[PDB]
Design an enzyme around this catalytic site. Structure first.
Site, mmCIF file in Angstrom:
data_model
loop_
_atom_site.group_PDB
_atom_site.id
_atom_site.type_symbol
_atom_site.label_atom_id
_atom_site.label_comp_id
_atom_site.label_asym_id
_atom_site.label_seq_id
_atom_site.Cartn_x
_atom_site.Cartn_y
_atom_site.Cartn_z
ATOM 1 N N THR A 1 -0.140 -0.404 -7.436
ATOM 2 C CA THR A 1 -0.217 -1.106 -6.126
ATOM 3 C C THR A 1 -1.434 -0.634 -5.342
ATOM 4 O O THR A 1 -1.824 0.531 -5.412
ATOM 5 C CB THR A 1 1.057 -0.881 -5.282
ATOM 6 O OG1 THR A 1 2.201 -1.374 -5.995
ATOM 7 C CG2 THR A 1 0.960 -1.594 -3.931
ATOM 8 N N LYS B 1 2.875 -8.570 -0.949
ATOM 9 C CA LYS B 1 2.927 -7.272 -0.295
ATOM 10 C C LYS B 1 2.358 -7.303 1.121
ATOM 11 O O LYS B 1 2.270 -6.252 1.763
ATOM 12 C CB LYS B 1 2.200 -6.233 -1.156
ATOM 13 C CG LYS B 1 2.743 -6.162 -2.586
ATOM 14 C CD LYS B 1 2.120 -5.038 -3.411
ATOM 15 C CE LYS B 1 2.514 -5.163 -4.882
ATOM 16 N NZ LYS B 1 1.920 -4.101 -5.742
ATOM 17 N N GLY C 1 1.356 -4.450 5.723
ATOM 18 C CA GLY C 1 1.548 -4.420 4.289
ATOM 19 C C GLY C 1 2.360 -3.199 3.907
ATOM 20 O O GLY C 1 2.589 -2.303 4.723
ATOM 21 N N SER D 1 -1.242 3.227 -5.362
ATOM 22 C CA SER D 1 -1.789 3.994 -6.476
ATOM 23 C C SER D 1 -3.285 3.765 -6.624
ATOM 24 O O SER D 1 -4.014 4.672 -7.043
ATOM 25 C CB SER D 1 -1.065 3.625 -7.772
ATOM 26 O OG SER D 1 -0.951 2.219 -7.904
#
Lengths: 174, 174, 174, 174, 174, 174, 174, 174, 174, 174, 174
Positions: free
Chosen positions: E1, E33, E45, E124
């Site tokens: 993500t 998201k 988000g 990430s």
């Protein structure tokens, strides 16, 4: 940490080091791990977080008020609430307390223990102090203050978590 | 363990503590972690097993003989054989050595390192000594011996694995 | 994170870095970890979540109003409620606060501590700053602002979680 | 640690930081992670122990001699011996090397890799540098040296294990 | 993500990928998201479970109603309840939110953070996007939408947990 | 990584992705995991380090020379030396190879395997490709190239370690 | 296990317990952990596997023959081979040895140590014995045999892995 | 800890050791783990914290008064409240109790058990005592006191957590 | 597994169970863990792999030939080669052997042990057998065969890895 | 532990072993793991703590009273409360129950399961009993009692945690 | 994996499944886990890597040649070399082999085992097959082939790692 208690010739003492370790570093060297309780009729020490002991010691004085200062029965009621209460169960410490009657240890498992000869030695350095204090108590006429002092210094030379800063509270009853 | 090296005003020194820890116990407090080498032209120290350093220091003198006392080139040949030999690879220690030329560190990974300003601080307490030695070297006119002395004492108060027993070997070249 | 407090010659200061780390990455470098409280009569710092300190600081001003600005007694009442309240127990931070009276640390274990010489050093880089501030305070006449400034810079060079962005709040009482 | 390689307009460069971390502490900030090889015809960098790279780079020059400086074939023979030899298998490092022909990565798993556009970014900060270098290479006319420089500085601001000390070795072939 | 936020020339944006990974497999590639909140005056988000964010976002709008839409003060009350409540403490997510006033991050540790230049990059792949967005923001006149778009695509090529499906919510205030 | 092999209507193919992952990062997206061997009479692919396959493929051609191109017998002699040699045992890869005779897998455990219907699917995404290739081979008349192509794309959408860059080597024998 | 060595008034002794524990069970209570070496000129003890010590003691006698009975130099050659040899490195034990010259410890890390006052205490109960032996040695005129005897009994009362079976080997040199 | 109960020839006994272990050290060797209850009509023992048993024993006398001294029914009501109460559930101990009717075990899981032949053996050394008591009861005419005595001594020789201090409470009903 | 050896009234025996466990499953219940050696002058047993004992017993007979059947000296030469040889070091078993002279244990650590009273009890159930055999040997006139038989049955009832299949080899010397 | 249920020719049975293991030792061999419920109209068994089943069985009879003895609907309400209640969630056991209607399993995950042919086999030895019971049920005319008996004995020979003590409760409905 | 061996009426057989699992995935369903050896005089099976067994079976034939086909003596020499050789020790598999003489198991621990009645059942499903084969062998006259067939199918229904693909090698000796 190291804490020692000795009883001889109408005298009883509790001595402890001031070292507070964080990981491999020394956080504070002058910690007061010994204090008096219940109108200075009781001496006590602790190995662990300072606030955890101040909580346990305050409740221990309340158990003494309910039991008229009886050391053993108040110690069991403290150990009973300690394991019982969900908030007190989180506390992690090793208590040591004594009066003119007897000396005993208290733990977070609920175990109340009175050592042979009322000789208490707790903390990471406790076993080292117990081996020194047991040697002097049998082979010398030294007073309980002299034994706890020299025993604690030996434990500080051995234990890396113990230092030579000292705090003592003697109680004379003769 | 802590070891410090400072170089100032034509002088360079190496100082280290005497503490030898086994688990949470002090094994020996008067360990000599500092010594002289190559006809007292070189000073050196070590953090680790006593014999592991005596082996590496002996071979380091032989590398100096082949290179006529050149510190840097002999240190690389020592670091080369250290990682290479199956016997030497088992050794675990942190070497520190210096002469009138320069100061540098040697490791079992084969890495040869000369710190900024030739300020070495190794051992479990090394970073603590480097923080204090860096403060005095920039903010005071103190001699390299005074810096390494005060820095090592501060590291002993902080590090639990370091004590205040001291061993020093100064080298004056001016 | 690192935060330092020094008291000298009628002056006391609190200094801290701006680094905010997320795992192995830098989230924010300009964090203000120091601020003033209680009509600018008190300076304070925090190591931990920003909001967790703002909650503890506001309540700390409340405890000061109940106790007429007494620093020690208000710090105990804050440490008392911190360990006690189920909401506040979840908070995780290391507070540092000082006034013209004295400097002390507060923790989520309920422990209130006043360091030797009122020298506070907290955060992941705290021990490094304490090592440098201890060296200058004894070996130099530098003012408490100069000591906390140079000490925090050394801690940022050493600690990877600390940077050189600085925020300071001095208090002069003479 | 962070290392970047960029190739543009007949130029190729390798840049890397000087930070050497031990746990949460900075061991050395001026480490030279970049150097030249094979008569200055090749530039290379490494992320890992300094001696581990000096051993691999020396053998890499020998593989170049056997293959007359062919970069790709020598890199496979190095990666072949690296995973093969019981001594070399213990080494842990991330190599980066390039010449006028092409740029490629070498690893201890035996994997030889040439990135898209010959853009290498390795180390703990490598992905951060790759995201910045990818942005400038497509959206600007900047020379490969300017990209690797600015990209490495951005990785040092983000990565806690990377600093802003820089070492560069450009190679012009046009 | 990966999620990115950029603010430039009276415009602010939030962009994020659609990848949802389960172990080593892709669960869903079109995840939304990013969304709008508080009468489309706020964009936000999230990186984490979709329901965990929908819970936090709904409460965040309630904190805005109590504070009349003030972004910072409502964010602290959300971070305060998040660490506090036993039910909210179980939630695991990384929130990002912004308005015409400022951009900031919210975390489950209670930490509220406003990045330098109001540049947010989480998930990430966040550090990768931050390195690309920092490069364009300083070396180009591109609008905040163009930066967040190209930065997110670079993070998807790098991060294995991020893909190129995109969702954006711009806010213009000029 | 994903690699697929299909055999139909006198045709056999091997297809594989180009993704090379390092941790959670994409190192290279255009890797050539497929190639030809033994005078273009054999096609093969590999999942693992690039050099590890180039070594095994070279020796596999030599085993073909000794056995006059016999695929099965040469594959066992390769699997025999692979587990046997101390050098080759360190190699870690998953080989796939096929000719007009038959398709089979080779592994570092020494295991030689010919799948049902000579359908090979290996790599992290291999099972996903086998599920799709099994569906088309039974329910469609599509040629082996069309099956391996569509199957590899589906594995790239699912596997995070697989991408849509493709390399194919068909072999027609009819 | 516990082993003690004391040196006083021209006499030196080594004493140790006989307990051999397997998990929480006592395997054997009469183990002989003390013996004589090199024509009864040297006494020694060991904490660990019985055969591991018999191998090290045999080689230690050979090192004494090469060095004409020199205790320190032979102990370093033993510690050198111990960490070096791949066979000896697997051995795990704690050696204690002494002669009329001096007492010292030997370890599998290669560390040779001579304690303060030549007082050795090793094994799981070693620190307990050191605290008792330190107390008597300073506060009594007792002979080294009397100290090691009483100290070992105290360690057996404390340590659960130590018992009161005793084996002693005195050496008189006066 | 070990506790044994034997019933023979109109006699039943309970015997237990006095060892109290803290980690690897002996806290107290004279612990009284056996006592009498319900007007000395019942004997009982406990393995665990001293206070936890004193609480369970007192309540057990209460259950006996409600059930007129019925051992089995009172033991169920104690096991019922033990598992049920949130306070009592925290208690950790192994109770053993017997009267002229029968012998049985009680546990914190709520399980009430009467062993074959009413032979109880609990604690860390319990299985060792059961093995010895089983041998004598079938192969000798020894009285239940002689069996529990010799069995507990054997368990102390084997178990490291058990010692030879003994406390017994016989009950004769004939 | 359990194996017992008893010596009484000119008789000595070795008995062992037949259980062979694989994980939580019984592989074989009639294993012969006892046999005779050296012209039926010696009896022996083993706990471990069947072949590992057959190798050690064969070599043990050869050591007896070189030493003319001396049990102790041959056992040390076996323990010497066992720890020494790289082949034998991989063997994992617990040997038990006895003759008219004495009984002793042999181990893969090289340790040769003669128990008190020549009572051997090894295997997972060994301590349980030693507890029962110790009880009968002191409290009964039973012959060594009767003790080893009853002791092994008690160990099978307790140990889950031991069963009641029995194999015995008595040796009468009177 | 092993428990088996078989249904044939108007008969259904539940059989289970008596072994109770603590670590590697047998705690009790005569445990009654089978009992009757709901006016002996229902038979049931359990694998786990005895009190945990007695709690679940009592509540299961209450669910039968609310549902008029309906087995399936009461089993779901039990499995519903089991996973739901914070106190029941702590319980760890495997229930087996059957009536004239059908046989089914109940678990602490809330899963209610009716095996093929109403053949239940649970416990550590359950799969072994299921393989034996499936063999006899298809290849013999044996009654359900004969199958559960012989199947349980086979599981005891195989499983180390199961013994041959048996308890059965048949139910005939024809 | 599951493999079964049965011997009856002059016939012996070995049967095994074809399932090869990788994690939670089926890699191959038609694996041949059974084969013949030594001029079809011996049948054998294996649970583990295919090449690990092909290496062990080849050497097993060589051990048979040295011992003239003796099954037991060759199996011990195989188990001796298996645990001994550093190369063979890395192999992990469970061998099963039989001839007209007897059936036995071989393991990587060096353990050679002949089950009761020469009934072998190994693999993850082995105990399930042993419970079914034990039931039919005692309660039916079925031939060894019929037992191993039906037993393996039952193990495949139970074990998730076993399937119903079958391979058998019967040996008739009558």
């Amino acid at each position: 940490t190291t804490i020692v208690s000795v009883r001889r010739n109408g005298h009883v003492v509790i001595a402890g080091d001031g070292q507070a370790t964080l990981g491999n570093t020394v956080m504070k060297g002058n910690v007061k791990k010994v204090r008096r309780l219940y109108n200075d009729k009781v001496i006590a020490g602790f190995a662990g977080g300072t606030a955890d002991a101040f909580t346990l010691f305050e409740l221990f004085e309340r158990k003494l008020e309910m039991h008229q200062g009886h050391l053993v029965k108040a110690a069991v009621e403290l150990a009973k609430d300690w394991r019982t209460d969900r908030m007190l169960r989180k506390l992690e410490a090793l208590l040591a307390v004594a009066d003119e009657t007897a000396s005993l240890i208290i733990t977070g498992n609920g175990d109340v223990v009175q050592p042979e000869n009322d000789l208490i030695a707790i903390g990471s350095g406790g076993p080292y102090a117990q081996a020194a204090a047991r040697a002097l108590l049998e082979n010398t006429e030294l007073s309980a203050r002299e034994i706890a002092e020299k025993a604690l210094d030996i434990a500080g030379d051995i234990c890396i978590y113990t230092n030579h800063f000292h705090t003592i509270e003697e109680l004379s009853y003769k």
